[model samples]
Target: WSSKIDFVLSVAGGFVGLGNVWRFPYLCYKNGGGAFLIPYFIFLFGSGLPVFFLEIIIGQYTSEGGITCWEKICPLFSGIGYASVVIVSLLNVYYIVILAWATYYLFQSFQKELPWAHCNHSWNTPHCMEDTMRKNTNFTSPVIEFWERNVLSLSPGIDHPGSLKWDLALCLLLVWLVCFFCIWKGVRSTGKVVYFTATFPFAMLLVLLVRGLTLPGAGAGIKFYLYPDITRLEDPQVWIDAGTQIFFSYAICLGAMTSLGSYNKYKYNSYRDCMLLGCLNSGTSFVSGFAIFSILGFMAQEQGVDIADVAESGPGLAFIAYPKAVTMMPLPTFWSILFFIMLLLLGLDSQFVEVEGQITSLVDLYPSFLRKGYRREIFIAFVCSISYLLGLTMVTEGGMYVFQLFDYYAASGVCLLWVAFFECFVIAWIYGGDNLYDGIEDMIGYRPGPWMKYSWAVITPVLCVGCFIFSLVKYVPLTYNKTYVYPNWAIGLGWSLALSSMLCVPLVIVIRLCQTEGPFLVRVKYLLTPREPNRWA
Candidate 1:
């Protein structure tokens, strides 16, 4: 199923994604300019690389997908696999909605005058002002209104979900079709696709970098992005941001890595592959910030505002700031098309890997049922169809509110920390860290160094728990535009979504213990101890 390069490219595709493009640049500017890299690389070595390498080791050593791979390690925590599947499934539904948005923009990029570039439109509110001259003193820009009014036609609240926006619905359908064709044959199709999906974005980034550097005030933006404020290092949020970014950027606890690793040959040097891709992932994140902030710098300068005023995270940056910045560039259509196309490809690359992880998990768990001729395709069709159905809720007029809820809670660092804590604990303590080292040794002919063992047993879990606590302490009520407070009930639903993955850890332990024929302690012991003829056995 995989050549060495295939596995490397797939993992790279998953690791280097929209987070690198959208999230990292903003965090860098927000945290401490270039100083963010200090903590970022620190956590990368201490926590990110070790956990990522361990997952690869697990998959290649077990030759199993995300779920069943745990059965051989420790059956009690097989729930980790199920939880991974649930988290990834939730992620895939909302994630594609973003791709659909990007696709819609990709189409609009080719228009004679970009819809977002002007304020005169049926959807434009009285407040909308064309900032073409960058003299609008209003806080709101036409780009934001274009996103809120034209693209979203957003409802005021989540309680009353407005009717579906047919245009967005159509875009979503096209996105699903693109995803289906890209992955219908599983890795066979995806491998070929990654050659484009994975590599083309770098090309686009270099083009943007050249264009961005030549723009007016480009130096100011780059200076602001990379200028160090060493005092900010004392902020706990800086460390927390670094840790979480490393987690998300490396694609840990999401099952995609394990699934991608599953396809590697038994004898592949995954340790070497992990190191190579991990560096590439971090390097890409750093380089991407240059392309992002340079343009943002030009936008700030054009608008006669500070970079802080224009800089935004997540959707705000990608849709509002970046597009607005692009409109001001020469050959705006050309740059806009290239940028959105890069985003679409980046989104697609990550999307297929996510879908692949889920499919691999199902086939591994129920080989007889899902691996028969045409059964794999049937199963994938089921997955894509159901995901599309669930995703429809996000295209409703009020869908952005729903999207925010899921993005805030379901994909937050809290869940990632909890899952990662258990992943390290199960492998390091429950299943035996030494045994994992031996497992790697069998394939690579040498055990991983003590650094790997120490990180798994101590460093990684401690960092995860520490950051999770900080996140809880610093948590604030969700809001939009500093005015639209989410209803308490919506917040409750968000917590429940987070708990869906967390509760699986204990739920499976109890279910497994109760079903086993033994006294309580014996059943507990059996659950904690690894089963079968390899590793701990």
Candidate 2:
């Protein structure tokens, strides 16, 4: 990378996406506002940061991409890499669909009167009313009506599979096209793009925050955002939510950071890099809570409803309610465009980097093929097309249901903790803690202690197991748009999508062992052995 700052900004852009603005705020409020941080920091320091450091060390030390890195660590567990890859690859399709939503919203932003501001349009049913401004009881807000009727053209459920909409397809194509070229020259393209993408949102954030806070009813929403009712901690739910949030928000075990860390200068120190990203990522989430909560309060006050009753789904609230929130202000078009552009750019950063990680892994695996002239380009083009094709399920009327199903199952938090457990187990236990510690001290010039070793070998993996087991014990079936419960078949398909990537871990283990000669025990031991070249013959 030409600019050393590139990797930092690249990752800086990567994890800080729509989740910061959309999901985190609601989770904070739901989990006891500021009090949520008790479990949050506990999980962050206890698990998130250590795994975070472990990934960076593994990447930079081996100087390898996600999949190939494990081959050096312990050949038997290359399954971990494949599992991570498969999870991320599954995620790529649905993840980019969000950019399609943002693209369509941005396209609609250029207008004297915003589309969702009133019930005047044809998509608006008789029940649609400019609520916050109400006609009848039980009328739908124009913003939500716009999201369902205009943007989504929503069908009944995942089983429905309504016909595809060209507008969404084209927007998805546009996003993929933009993403492909952003990394057209690979890392150099990404480095240049990051400075703009990383910096723009903060500038917009302050303005958005200020404008939103100035709204008349902003105080009540802000109260819930920071209400910090300490008693909410009694429920195990808060702890689970905190643990899940820490894992997903840091994006550990997800392969992208490991891929980003692989590009560092050999002597470049990453302790500070990890620390900066951790702090900044959480900081962005905190501020996002403020900006969004205030606007949500603004919505509740106008409608004479509670903030909890505002929007059903997370995306619906952010996408639909926010447009309405901005619509209530002067120069609605300007604020509307402002928010979506930031949203699109933020999501695009995560999208391109994710595919880049996969591309890098393939390039590492078969450099002779992928590193050839324009071969990387062709492969990336191929990746984008495949992702776009799979995401076609999301653009239909039933798209949101399928998307929600995918959200619940595919690339779910269960997969993250599952990968996290083994990733921790292999390195701290199987791969030799002394070797990892030595590598860390050698790279960063910091004399290491057993604390992190304890973290890796015991603390981290234990938390991973605890969280995974606890989640399954407390699990509930997924629902759609509040009222629609997913049928058992939808649940089956969801599990299939989820279990598919995870199955790669164990499947690769059997396959690797079978290929080796000798007794099963010897083959297992041989693959587990860490050699300079990880030779097998």
Candidate 3:
């Protein structure tokens, strides 16, 4: 349904997300200067590549989206298919919050000084030493109090004590506007837009990397990112973190891959695309690490701190670390402008693909609305507006708290692990794993390695399940300013979401078995009996 160029660009857009920009760099720095690559490479080849090739193969072969694809491949697995739809839908709704934040920051970059980086006068009164680094602790107390009193305040801007601007309203407008525009035109527009959205970030990374590598402490940052410390692997939690990172970052569980694959022509050789896109995604992750660390090296030198102190993970990477770098650059305004524009484009492309999964899925599931002569565009508008308003809460007074909840659990809460494991198993074991391998080689002209089979069948599932359990035990409830406690219920909800998807697999099996009748029953009998099946049968 899309041009080959569009397929390439869309694949790129879908794979590269905030994770490539933020997570990759943060992990590299934390792991070991020059050493992290050892394990990272191990994981990328071991888990990432195999799973990627498999999802594409599964979707393209079936020519269905999400769990629906599952039914055609292996009827018993259809519930897992539906569960993925639910998980992705929830994730798509939640991820818009981060896009909203990126939108807000893009606007802030247009101004002279970064609001979060205004630390000198606010913290130490004037004469500041290199050791006197700016810490959020200084303002955390006041910020908490402000939030408590103004929980429902729709004043728009983050209350900066005396500042009266509604920066938030601006952020909300900007985020949804870009999101609406990209996908509202449908895939035709998104396919073209992905070149800039997907590829330009790497170009900026090249510019930033050259500048960053030449900086005074760039060596330190590179060391932080690449330094190998195999000892950390002994902790097990490090391995768990690696597993979770792959689970979330690959975007496999999001169900978008299924929707995107539907556009491929019957003979499009999707298995190749899977391997290509996965490797490309990991390649970008690798490149981004250098770009991010090089900047951090500069920041560390400026503040007289180790790269560890300034390096961060999650949303803080955007809110604090990168902005801090933007302000410290030689031409602060020019660099900030370039960085945020690149950011908005990068985030915009990924967000559009994500939401497009939901939009397209709705179209397929309820085609009768269109068949009945109801305008589909009006329905699309209603869906977009509702999602926009619901997302408005993330920019409200208690916005950060809401954001944190989604970030902590639902975002990577490991709720979808069961299905990820199920997906791999279904592909590898239930749905003709070896046969699919033959089919891929037939189409792509290269056979995947035996390691891929082992990873999908055993390694990824074990690793993901292990990480999910370990995270539950190791998760520390971080308090805000020693007063605000993030309720445990938030974590529970995330687990529930994940389990719900896992549970759907069996439930669907039961329902399908119960519905066995007429043609459906005849088809079930043949699937069970094993006969010569068509390639796209």
Candidate 4:
């Protein structure tokens, strides 16, 4: 709040994380290349922006964190905040693993030669191929072997508890240790931290894009990235995936936006802020696609393969796919250091705020004790320590399997949509859409059109539910490297992870009602109304 730039940088830092950089570029290609943009926009206008605006304005108006604000907005759905906190808390756990994976990669890049460039490692299988043998699908590329054996030392499946790899465990701690200082001081720390942490990726992406475009096959690669497969849009799953990407990348339904917005000046109109940030995120992904495809396209040419054969998502995209290209580049070390450092910073900035938002809500709950003295620092240290310990599971031999399982289910768009609709429901249906509009109207001199009302009340909620249901119907079982099928209990474990946060929604609704006095109708009416009448007043 002291300096205006921190708020902008912090929001941008959190919003534009691995979702846009690591995830969206590959997702854009997977769904339908350029055609993915259509469904993306569909979700953007349909639910994403509406909910995005709803989130910021809720905090901007209330000037409060997510959990506490719900009691004032519509007490019946105060569970929404607990679910968001729990959802984000679960996110904090697995998200650390992702960051640690990046940390591990970044550390490895500092070697005399990129470790993935060789097949002579102790763990390499006979199937592992060295420098020139990646041309055929028959051989396991050294890059992948490095990921599975050298890094993860992977176990058979999620059911198997393999020994922890000290390398990855240290990387996990390194990530947590570095993050401890970044957020321990509150918004001020995030304030100063985001200068380079927030903006450095763009500089790297710009440089990488320039380097990629100059590579031999980057042109054709970018062509593959953008090649439209319009028919893919007919499948409902594209819409679902697109909706998830939109919601995921935009940071909707998560409290970072809400918590970050709480720090804004009450007189500020955030409409422009949302639109500008949205454009930055989408634009960043589009351009990063060019950066990815150019190198991947070049690698495909070098490998005597098609682009699809080389392209991968998740860890495969960053660690295996892109790094293979890096190994082939003129100055492999230069590009390698630059690429992973950017990833580390991008992921770190996002975690900084998610952790901060979680702690902010907790302190808001007990400002007297937790907010004063060393209590806040002690509490954050406790959270960071516990999260680091939880992250150790993912750094174990079978960690990638566990990581993927969590990535698939925890804080997933299914629950995100489920929780998102009610926030809109409570706002539009319960708090009244017109009242939201009037609040926005009062905050900013320019009044929004009646479209705001219809969007929040019906269109947004409908799309959220529609997307949620279709994604549920189309859910597929988890697999590793596209081959290893997860056992029944592993699937159960993932579902438990999912339901852990989602169950909070209805469970809290029941508990809130039961704890209230009078008959069911009276409790229902009382819970539905704001704790303070004229919160708008």
Candidate 5:
């Protein structure tokens, strides 16, 4: 089902989204500017690239599908099998939320008279946009939370984050509509549309990059992004953050790719697929550094502010910092529209892929649904509409807070890493990594470099476990107003939902294992005591 070109673009599109534009530039600045790439590259090779290779191997070899693939390949270890499903589902749920935010921002870029440029009412309030307005200079806010003193302002937090009623209501509707539309058509539409999704954003980004670099303090911003201050290098958190960034970007553990890869035929030559996709994924990030840093550099120069003051978290960087830069340019309104539209499209394409994984899984498991001849659009509509309703909470008074909490603590980055960790372990140990690798090479007619062997066998697992622990040790409590918030109960609820999605695989295995009573299968005993030694062997 996957041609070489299709495979390349699809995998790259999967990796390229908010992580590239929203997350990467902010991360580079913190990790030591140019110095951060040192550890990042190290982890990419040891952990990121290895895990990427490992996942492709599992999907292509089994050709059955995600959690099921795990059970079929290694029936003895069902806990890891269950975790794979949970991790992918948790990721998918939150990913849909980001798409909703992108939709929210896209429509807001159309105001003729912008508000973030003037000194207006409510300037000094705790959450006022007065601080964000750049009146003396050319820079204006592209993203205005709401109007104050007859001028636009950036809403401080999610509570006052502009419109809760109509804007948020619109946000919910648009998110569901776009996601459902893209996915309902299935890959027929997704595959066709992704050409633009994967390519056009680069054009917009490049334009911004060129414009940003020529501006006054653009070089300083770029330097801040790339320059690695040696002092920050020793910070262990830097390495841990880099690992988190990799997990967020590469998407190794997310079962989404397994769902995507399952659509390909067995002879699809996944080795080449992995290499091309690996390069494209890394390539997109490298190219984005230019798109992001140039803007930050220009903004820092214009305001005569330190790069640190200009720096921000992912959501802040995209909605606040970047918009702040765009307004400084000629025709702020048009540029703002194009830029946010590009951002919306970027998230839309990736969102389609993630949601498609769920719909596709449903169809794959229950052929009767597809067998009933339900139009593909019906499935997409059903899934997208449901996810959007859940999103109303984020647009609600307490929604953003709730969404942020889930984004932060509910899903485990290491949980996905462990899925990859053991997935590779099983492919290498139980399924026969060499045989599979040779088969992949045979299909592609090119051997992978020596790095593949060591990476698959050794590096991915070690660094994943190490990085996970490091983040956990450094964990701090979540707070709203000096009060410790998002207690264990809330965290547990999120995790339980995620775990339920993951449990689908093992539950199926138990059903399959129970019906057979042959000396070889041991269906009953295996379900009750899964840890029981394999007499079937």
Candidate 6:
């Protein structure tokens, strides 16, 4: 199903996306300054690499999509595949909203002067202060106001989804269209698209990194980003953040690796591929800190404030802070265009595989439907259209609120950790690690070493369970920009979003047990036993 490079680029592109570009830098600053990498790389090897390699080999060996791939290995836990699709589906609906926001900024960047640079626009409130004005007063940031008022046209609350923001709606449509065309032919086309979408972001990132390093106070920014407090590592949340960052950054437990691996020929060397991409993913995050913190450092220097005051993650950093920082660079328009274009590519590459994973699941489940001419295209169109319609909710006047809800709940660490633990447990314990090792050896001619085996059987699962427990204990209410706390009802809705995916595991267990012909213990044992009838066929 895939040549060697085809699989590597696809998986790497899927793994390296908005999380690396936007989330990692802010996390580095917030966690332990520069010392966060200690935990980050620790989890990367101990947890991330093990599960990543395991999932990839599972799909490559089975040569099946996410849902049925699990059905082949351990039928009782097939729901993990379904859960992954559900999570990715829910995630893609709002995930495109991020690209839509990037799309909006990319369009705005083509202007002679970047619109967010000054405060004179109609959307600007009286309190708006141009970022370059160096106004650290009580006045609102022009960039923030531009994001909230101009782009989002944000309503007061989720209840007040007053009107659709047509501009963003159009941008969202464009984003879905780009995603649809990229993957409509499935991986055949997606593989081709990633050649540009995947590799181009690094070029832009390198350019920005060099430019940022040369800017005034770039050293200060780099220092602030990497200045190790060492003491911050003792905080449990820092460890939790590190684990979460690795999960999200690697794009694991979302069926992407499995789906991508499913496309590889039986003889592919996933061991080396996983190792290369895993290292590349972590390296990208580390390097991105330089680009992000340098600009942030310049912002702080300009305002005579600390880097902490200006550094942010997610949309605030991407839309507000970075754009503001670009305005301070010479030829603001050129720099702005490059930054937003880079953002567009990053988001686009990630969105492609997300949609591909969804498509792969449906096609694998319904091979008959795919037999007809243009059926594949029709299915792609159908899913993209439906996802577009569902995503319209996020384009409403209060859509940013909904976006925040989905981001906090659907894309949060709690859900990822829950899914991660089960995935590791089902593979290592239920399917049997020795058996999986044999399976890998049958395909690739080499068994995983003791380090990999120990990571899967013990270290990864324990860390995931520990992270999950600590996440629950340290849970905080969802808030937007440290303000606008979601009401209890809204928070309930968020958990339901998370549980919508997670509940599949236990639900499948109960249902599978019910269908088995035996006493409760017997049925449980039968369900957990390795059931692959076509092992390395």
List candidate 4 segments past 4 Å from native: 1-15, 29-35, 130-137, 186-195, 234-236, 367-374, 532-537
Please write out the lDDT profile of model 5 over residues 403-504, one tens digit for every residue.
Answer: 655554344434455566666675566556676566567445677776877777777666666766765686544433223356576666655654554455
For model 4, state the Cα shift of residue 417 in Å: 0.8
Supply the global lDDT for candidate 3.
0.61
Q: Candidate 3: where are CA atoms >4 Å away?
A: 1-15, 26-39, 112-166, 187-199, 228-231, 234-237, 268-272, 311-314, 370-373, 445-447, 468-485, 514-537
C-alpha-based local distance difference test score of model 1: 0.78
Candidate 4, 1-537: lDDT as tens digits:
576654654355544678877777656655556678788877777777778878888888887778877878887788889888888888888877877777888888887898888888887898776646555336666787888787778788777767888888888888888888878754454445647766677787787777778778777787777776778766666776677778778877777777777777767768877766777777777777788778878877766667776645444476666677677668898888888888887787778878887887877777887767555688889988988888878888877788877766776646787778888888998998777777788675577776667878998788878776766786666665556898898888888987887888799998998899998999999888876622543
Clashes of 2: 1
Q: How many backbone clashes does candidate 3 have?
A: 12
Candidate 1 lDDT tens digits, 1-537: 557545655445544688788767756765656678888888899989998998888878776678877887788888998888778878888878888888888877877988887777777777655555657425556787788888888798988787988889999999998888878854444445646766778887787677778788888888877776788776666777677778778888887787678777777777877888888888889887887788878877877777767644434466775787687678899888988888887787778777877777777776875787555788878888999988888899888888877765675546777888899999899878877777777778787789989999999888887777765786666665445889999999989998998788789887998899868888877877655524322
Write down the worst ten-residue block by lDDT for model 5: 528-537
Q: Candidate 2 lDDT, tens digit per residue, 349-396?
A: 677768887777767667875787555678878877888899998988
Determine the backbone clash count of candidate 4.
0
Tens-digit lDDT track for model 3 on 1-537? 557664654445546677787656654554444655665566677776666666766666666787567656776666766776676666665676665556655665676655444423343323333322433122222111222233223232222223222566466666776677767776454445645665677777777667667667778777767666767655444554455466667877767776666666656656556666677777777777776777777776766656665544334454445655555568777876787778766666667767777777777776886525787667667777776666665666656555545654554545545667777877767665687777667655678778777888888777667766766677655333223565676556555755665677788777866777667767566444322222454
Candidate 3, after superposition: displacement of residue 405 in Å? Answer: 2.7
Q: How far is candidate 3 from the true structure (C-alpha RMSD, Å)?
A: 5.7
Q: List ranges where model 6 is wrong by over 4 Å.
A: 1-15, 26-32, 131-137, 185-198, 228-237, 311-314, 367-378, 533-536
| TM-score-better candidate, 2 vs 4 | 4
Q: Pick the candidate with the highest TM-score.
A: 4
Q: Residue-wise lDDT of candidate 6 within 1-537, one digit each (tens)?
A: 558545655445544678888877756765546778777888998999888888898888777777877777888887888888888988888888888888888888887877776789999888766556764436666676788788888788888888888888999998888788667644444546746766678777887787778778888878767767778765666777788789888888888888778777787677877888888888888887788788878777776656776644434466665777677678988878877888887787677767877776777766775845455787888888888988998999888788777876786656777788888888777777887787788778787689888888899888878777766786666666555777889999999999999898889877898888968888777766665634657
Candidate 3 vs candidate 4: the lDDT winner is 4
lDDT of 2 at 107: 92
